[PDB]
C-alpha cells in the first residue's frame, strides 16, 4: 500500500496474512473456515494468520491456522490474470471475535465512485503494521482507458489516476471492501502508484456462486 496510512490495531478483522515462514500475500475471511485470496498467490504450503497488526511481534490476538485446501479457480489465466481468485480452507475453525471477523460477500456489483477500503502488508515504495487506503471504484471505461484491451469482465479499477495511492507487491490477495461488501481482490497493475495505472482487482461480484459452491463442495 502506497500513500496510505497505518490502519490501527485490529480495525480490519477480516484482513489476514498469508504466511509460509514469511508474509507473502493477504486475504479475506468470509466465513469461519474459508479465506479468499488471489490465485497468483498459490503455493503448496500456506499458513493463514488472523487477528494481526504487527506481523513481526506477537501481540496476543493472533490465530495461526494452516490451510487444509487450496482451490485455485479452474478458469484462472496465468497471462491475462483472468479469474485471479483462490479459496483457502483452514485446518481448524477460526475463533471469531471483534478482532477476528468475517467480511460479507458481494450483495451486488458496486457503482462507479464507491468509496472502498484497501489494506495489506505490501510495499509502500514490507512494513510491520497494517496499511490502510481509502480509494473509490473507477468506471469500467476508465479502467480500460488505463489498460487498453487488458481489462476483462471480471476486473475493475479501484484507486486513482493521479497516482501516489495504490496496491503493490505483497498486498496481493488483500481485500477491497466497499460498504460492508468484499468487492475487489488485489490482483495486478503496472507497478504501483504510477499515474493512469491504478490497481486492477478481481471482481468478486461475479464469483459468489463459484465461492459458495466450492464451500458447499468442501
Ligand atoms: Ca502480531
Swiss-Prot record:
EC numbers: 3.4.21.4
PTM per Swiss-Prot/TrEMBL: Subsequent cleavage after Lys-125 leads to alpha-trypsin. Further cleavage after Lys-165 yields pseudotrypsin. A cleavage may also occur after Arg-99.
Keyword 4Fe-4S: no
GO CC term (a single one): extracellular space
InterPro entries given in the database record: Peptidase_S1_PA, Peptidase_S1_PA_chymotrypsin, Peptidase_S1A, Serine_Proteases_S1, Trypsin_dom, TRYPSIN_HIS, TRYPSIN_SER
Catalytic activity reported: Preferential cleavage: Arg-|-Xaa, Lys-|-Xaa
An MF annotation (GO) of this entry: serpin family protein binding
Main localisation: secreted
Active site (UniProt): 40, 84, 172
Transmembrane spans: none
Mechanisms controlling activity: Is inhibited by scorpion cyclotide trypsin inhibitor TopI1.
Any GO BP annotation: proteolysis
Residue numbers binding Ca(2+): 52, 54, 57, 62
Record key words, sorted: Calcium, Digestion, Disulfide bond, Hydrolase, Metal-binding, Protease, Secreted, Serine protease, Signal, Zymogen
Cofactor notes: Binds 1 Ca(2+) ion per subunit.
Binding positions for substrate per the UniProt entry: 166-167, 169-170, 172
Disulphide-bridged cysteine pairs: 7-132, 25-41, 109-205, 116-178, 143-157, 168-192
Cofactor(s) in the UniProt record: Ca(2+)
All copies of domain Peptidase S1, residue ranges: 1-216
Oligomeric form and interacting partners: Interacts with SERPINA1.
Protein family (similarity comment): Belongs to the peptidase S1 family.
Protein's name according to its UniProt entry: Serine protease 1
Organism annotation: Bos taurus (Bovine)
